[PDB]
Amino acid sequence: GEVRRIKLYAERLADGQMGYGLEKGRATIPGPLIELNEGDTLHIEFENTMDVRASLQVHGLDYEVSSDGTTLNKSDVEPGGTRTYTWRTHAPGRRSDGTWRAGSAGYWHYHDHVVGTEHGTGGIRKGLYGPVIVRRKGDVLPDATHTIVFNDMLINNRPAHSGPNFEATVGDRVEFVMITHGEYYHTFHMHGHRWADNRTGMLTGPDDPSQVVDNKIVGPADSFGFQVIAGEGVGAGAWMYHCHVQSHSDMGMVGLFLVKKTDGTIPGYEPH
Amino acid sequence: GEVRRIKLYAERLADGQMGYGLEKGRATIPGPLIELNEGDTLHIEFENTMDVRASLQVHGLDYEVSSDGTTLNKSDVEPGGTRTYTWRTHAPGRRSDGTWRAGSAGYWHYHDHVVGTEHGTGGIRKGLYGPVIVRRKGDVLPDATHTIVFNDMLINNRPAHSGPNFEATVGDRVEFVMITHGEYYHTFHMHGHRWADNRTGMLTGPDDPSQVVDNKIVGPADSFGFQVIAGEGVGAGAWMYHCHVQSHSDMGMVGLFLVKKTDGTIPGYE
Amino acid sequence: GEVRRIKLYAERLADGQMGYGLEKGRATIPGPLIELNEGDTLHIEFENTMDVRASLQVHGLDYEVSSDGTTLNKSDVEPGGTRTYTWRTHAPGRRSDGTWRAGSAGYWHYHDHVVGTEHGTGGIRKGLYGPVIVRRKGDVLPDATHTIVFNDMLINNRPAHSGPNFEATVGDRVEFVMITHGEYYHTFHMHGHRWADNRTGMLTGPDDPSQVVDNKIVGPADSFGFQVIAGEGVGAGAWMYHCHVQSHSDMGMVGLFLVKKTDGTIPGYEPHEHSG
Ligand SMILES: [Cu+2]
Ligand SMILES: [Cu+2]
Ligand SMILES: [Cu+2]
Ligand SMILES: [Cu+2]
Ligand SMILES: [Cu+2]
Ligand SMILES: [Cu+2]
Ligand SMILES: [Cu+2]
Ligand SMILES: [Cu+2]
Ligand SMILES: [Cu+2]
Known part of the structure; x- marks a missing residue:
C-alpha cells in the first residue's frame, strides 16, 4: 500500500463544457484515469479553477465524510479554492465475525457533486467525470x-x-x-x-x-x-x-x- | 423447517393510501417485514378491511395457484373478506438426475395484485407492498x-x-x-x-x-x-x-x- | 465441431411486418430458433426477398466483418440478393497468457441491422429477430x-x-x-x-x-x-x-x-359453465 499524491484541476473548457485535468489547461472529458492497488491511499490536491463551486466524489473507494465532496458534508470547493481529497482502499480479508470483507478492487468513477445542483447534475452534464480502476494483487x-x-x-x-x-x-x-x-x-x-x-x-x-x-x-x-x-x-x-x-x-x-x-x-x- | 401463522390486514390510510399491517390500525408502508428460514411454511390469515377487492401476491416463495392472489386464479379477497394464503419455502438440494435445485432463500417482497387493475397497479401505487426475507442455514x-x-x-x-x-x-x-x-x-x-x-x-x-x-x-x-x-x-x-x-x-x-x-x-x- | 448449412429468407409479412423463415412463404416472428454446440460452424445462405436492403447480425457468436450485416462493413444484402453469412463458435479454454477464454455458449439472438436505419430500427420493429442458443458440452x-x-x-x-x-x-x-x-x-x-x-x-x-x-x-x-x-x-x-x-x-x-x-x-x- 503506497501513499500517493496527484494534483487535479476542474477547468471550464473553451467550448461550453467542464473537465478535470492533471495540469492547468490540460483538462479532458472524461477526466484522467486514476489507477490504484488495493491498500493504496491517494491524496488528490484538487484546485477548482472555475467561478462556481465544484467538488470531487468517488464511488466504491473508502473515504471519510470530509471527502464526500458534498454540501451535506461541507466538502465541496469554493470558486478558485483548493482542497485535499483523500481516497483509501483495502484488500479483501476475513473478519473476526467469520464473514468475508470485500476488497476495494473494481471499475469505479469520480464526478462532481455540486455544479448546477446539489447532485452535480450540471457538472456531470458538462463533463466533470472520470474513471478509477482499483486492481487486486494478481489481476x-x-x-x-x-x-x-x-x-x-x-x-x-x-x-x-x-x-x-x-x-x-x-x-x-x-x-x-x-x-x-x-x-x-x-x-x-x-x-x-x-x-x-x-x-x-x-x-x-x-x-x-x-x-x-x-x-x-x-x-x-x-x-x-x-x-x-x-x-x-x-x-x-x-x-x-x-x-x-x-x-x-x-x-x-x-x-x-x-x-x-x-x-x-x-x-x-x-463510417457514418 | 417450522409451520408459522400470522394475521395480516389491508387497510386504507390517509391521502387515499393503502397499507398492510400485522394488527388492525397498525398498517404501514412498506408493510411488515416477514422473515422465514428455508423449509418454513407460513399461513397468512388475511383480512381485507377495505371496500374494494384486494389480494396478496408474493415473489420467490413456493405457493400453489390458490395463493397466487390474482383474479386469474380466483384468489383475491372480496371487500371485508378473509382468506388464508400459504407460502412454503425449500432448502437447495440435488435432484435425482444430479441437477441442483435452487433454494427459496433471497430478498423477496409481497404486494397487491387486484387494486386499480388486474396487476395491482393502484394497490402498489397506494402502498400495498412489503418485504420478505428467506434465510438459508448459516446465514x-x-x-x-x-x-x-x-x-x-x-x-x-x-x-x-x-x-x-x-x-x-x-x-x-x-x-x-x-x-x-x-x-x-x-x-x-x-x-x-x-x-x-x-x-x-x-x-x-x-x-x-x-x-x-x-x-x-x-x-x-x-x-x-x-x-x-x-x-x-x-x-x-x-x-x-x-x-x-x-x-x-x-x-x-x-x-x-x-x-x-x-x-x-x-x-x-x- | 460440425459444419452446418441452412437457408434463411427475409420476407415481407402482412400488415407491414417482416420476418425470417427457413423456406419462402414460411417466415415467422420470432424467426427460427438456431441451435449449435460450441465448436460448430454455421453457414447461412441468406436471401433477401424484400424491396429494401436487409441483413443478419448475430450477438455473441464469432463472425468476421464480412458477416457483420452492417452498412459500415458493407455486409448487408440488396433487394432480391443472396449472401452467405458464416457464424463460428468455440469452446472455452486456457490462453497462453494464463487467462480463461470465455466460450461461445449462451442465449443469444440475431436480427436485421439495415431496414429503416443503419441500426435496423425499422427491421427489428417489423419482426426481423430470432433466437440462437449455443450449448456447451454436458449442458x-x-x-x-x-x-x-x-x-x-x-x-x-x-x-x-x-x-x-x-x-x-x-x-x-x-x-x-x-x-x-x-x-x-x-x-x-x-x-x-x-x-x-x-x-x-x-x-x-x-x-x-x-x-x-x-x-x-x-x-x-x-x-x-x-x-x-x-x-x-x-x-x-x-x-x-x-x-x-x-x-x-x-x-x-x-x-x-x-x-x-x-x-x-x-x-x-x-372455460365453460356447468348446468345447476
Ligand atoms: Cu455518484
Ligand atoms: Cu430514480
Ligand atoms: Cu451522491
Ligand atoms: Cu409481482
Ligand atoms: Cu415492459
Ligand atoms: Cu404478477
Ligand atoms: Cu444487435
Ligand atoms: Cu442509450
Ligand atoms: Cu449493432
Whole structure:
C-alpha cells in the first residue's frame, strides 16, 4: 500500500463544457484515469479553477465524510479554492465475525457533486467525470485502457456520430471502463467481442458460472469494465460499439473499436 | 423447517393510501417485514378491511395457484373478506438426475395484485407492498433491517425530500432490503458503503467473482438486499443513499444512513 | 465441431411486418430458433426477398466483418440478393497468457441491422429477430424451448393481450429464451418459478453464488435464458409471465405458462359453465 499524491484541476473548457485535468489547461472529458492497488491511499490536491463551486466524489473507494465532496458534508470547493481529497482502499480479508470483507478492487468513477445542483447534475452534464480502476494483487494488466461514458445521449460528451474511436492491434489485451451518467438507461453493446458479467470482466476458470454477454443494461452512475483479446476469433476490422436502444444508436450513440492487423492495415469500412 | 401463522390486514390510510399491517390500525408502508428460514411454511390469515377487492401476491416463495392472489386464479379477497394464503419455502438440494435445485432463500417482497387493475397497479401505487426475507442455514443475521422501496418517484411513499433516514452505530451489521415498483427504472446508490451483487450482498469468500458495487440499476418488482458493517473503513457520518438518476435525486429521492460514533454523536452535517 | 448449412429468407409479412423463415412463404416472428454446440460452424445462405436492403447480425457468436450485416462493413444484402453469412463458435479454454477464454455458449439472438436505419430500427420493429442458443458440452437439454421477445410494448409482435401462452406438464424441463428489443426497458417476471441469474439459469451446485430471481430488468438487445422444472414445488396451474412495469402489464405484456397435472388438467381452469 503506497501513499500517493496527484494534483487535479476542474477547468471550464473553451467550448461550453467542464473537465478535470492533471495540469492547468490540460483538462479532458472524461477526466484522467486514476489507477490504484488495493491498500493504496491517494491524496488528490484538487484546485477548482472555475467561478462556481465544484467538488470531487468517488464511488466504491473508502473515504471519510470530509471527502464526500458534498454540501451535506461541507466538502465541496469554493470558486478558485483548493482542497485535499483523500481516497483509501483495502484488500479483501476475513473478519473476526467469520464473514468475508470485500476488497476495494473494481471499475469505479469520480464526478462532481455540486455544479448546477446539489447532485452535480450540471457538472456531470458538462463533463466533470472520470474513471478509477482499483486492481487486486494478481489481476491481469492490459496493453491499453479506454474509457467509454454514456452521459445522457452523448458518448464522452462527443457530438452525435463523432466517436470516440479506439485503435488496437489484433491480439492486444484491451481494457474498457464503461460508466453511465445522467437521466437515461442505456444498453452497452460491442460487435465481435464479449465479456463476463463479473468483477473483472473475465471468467476465473471453467467453474465460473457468470453470464458471458455482449450487451448490458446500465443506468446513471453504474460502472463496469472488462478486458478482451482484440479481434480474438473474429479478426481485424472496424468493430462498432453502441448503445443498443434503437433511437439512441440512430441519434449517434455509436463509436468504433478499430482493430488493425500487425501490418497496421484494416478491412475497408464506411463510417457514418 | 417450522409451520408459522400470522394475521395480516389491508387497510386504507390517509391521502387515499393503502397499507398492510400485522394488527388492525397498525398498517404501514412498506408493510411488515416477514422473515422465514428455508423449509418454513407460513399461513397468512388475511383480512381485507377495505371496500374494494384486494389480494396478496408474493415473489420467490413456493405457493400453489390458490395463493397466487390474482383474479386469474380466483384468489383475491372480496371487500371485508378473509382468506388464508400459504407460502412454503425449500432448502437447495440435488435432484435425482444430479441437477441442483435452487433454494427459496433471497430478498423477496409481497404486494397487491387486484387494486386499480388486474396487476395491482393502484394497490402498489397506494402502498400495498412489503418485504420478505428467506434465510438459508448459516446465514449471518444482522443487528437491524431497513426496507427502502422506490415506488415510482417516492421512497416508501413519503413526500419528496423527506427520508426515510436510518440510524446505526459504527460497526453495527446493518441489512438493507431494496424493492422497486411502478413505472420507472432507478439506480440505487449508497455513499461510503458497497456490497456484492449476489444473494446476500456479501462475497462467499475468496473465490466468489461477483461484482462489488455501490450503485445498481433496478426496475419494477426487482428486489435485492445486502448487509454492511456501518462505517467500515469510512467512519461515522451522514451517508446519503439516493437514486442516482439525476432528475430523481434533484427531485428528492434521497435519504440518510446516519452512522453515529459509539458516544452517539455524528460529524456535523447539512 | 460440425459444419452446418441452412437457408434463411427475409420476407415481407402482412400488415407491414417482416420476418425470417427457413423456406419462402414460411417466415415467422420470432424467426427460427438456431441451435449449435460450441465448436460448430454455421453457414447461412441468406436471401433477401424484400424491396429494401436487409441483413443478419448475430450477438455473441464469432463472425468476421464480412458477416457483420452492417452498412459500415458493407455486409448487408440488396433487394432480391443472396449472401452467405458464416457464424463460428468455440469452446472455452486456457490462453497462453494464463487467462480463461470465455466460450461461445449462451442465449443469444440475431436480427436485421439495415431496414429503416443503419441500426435496423425499422427491421427489428417489423419482426426481423430470432433466437440462437449455443450449448456447451454436458449442458442439460430441455423437453421444450419457448422464445419470448419483448419488442417495444409487444410480445413477439403479437397484438396486446394476445399471449403467447406455452403449455407443459408438471415435471417437464422447460427452457425459456428471453430477448428484448426497441426503445424501452422492461422487467421480466414469472409467477411460481424462479431461476439463477447466470449463463444457464441453473445453479451449478452449492458453491454457485449467483442470484436466484423471479424478476429481471432487461433493455434493448439483452438476451438471457433459463430452464425450470415446470410446477416444481408449486403444482399445476395457469402461471402468468409478464413485464412487471405496471402500465406495460396493464396494456397487455402478459402471457400464460399453462402447467397441466400429469392427468392432463389445469387447476382452476373452467372455460365453460356447468348446468345447476
Ligand atoms: Cu451522491
Ligand atoms: Cu442509450
Ligand atoms: Cu455518484
Ligand atoms: Cu404478477
Ligand atoms: Cu430514480
Ligand atoms: Cu409481482
Ligand atoms: Cu449493432
Ligand atoms: Cu415492459
Ligand atoms: Cu444487435
